[PDB]
Amino acid sequence: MASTTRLVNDRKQLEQQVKDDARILADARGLNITTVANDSATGGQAIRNVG
């Protein structure tokens, strides 16, 4: 049990830190939403009256 047994955990922590500090410097820009539309209807059979 030496400093070599901590290598995998060291890599786990290093990957977490790399992701975290690459998220900080990444530039973020808003995007335009162009998908709004009322196209989600439902079908079926009409309940026609009889008489």
């Binding site: 989600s40 209807a41 439902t42 079908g43 079926g44 059979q45 009409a46 309940i47 026609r48």
Partner: protein, 50 residues
């Protein structure tokens, strides 16, 4: 002159006489589409959502 010695006549007649010009207005009934519109589709069961 264009009538014979025997005359054909009418015993009764009916007509409406109005003394005021504002008596010519009457009323009728209509559905209010804005608040009670006419239905355009029948009631159906839910199937084939897409």
């Amino acid at each position: 002159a264009v009538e014979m010695y025997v005359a054909v006549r009418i015993s009764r007649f009916q007509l409406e006489v109005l003394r005021d010009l504002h008596d010519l207005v009457r009323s009728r009934t209509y559905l209010d589409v804005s608040k009670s519109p006419l239905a355009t589709t029948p009631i159906r069961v839910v199937e084939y959502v897409r």
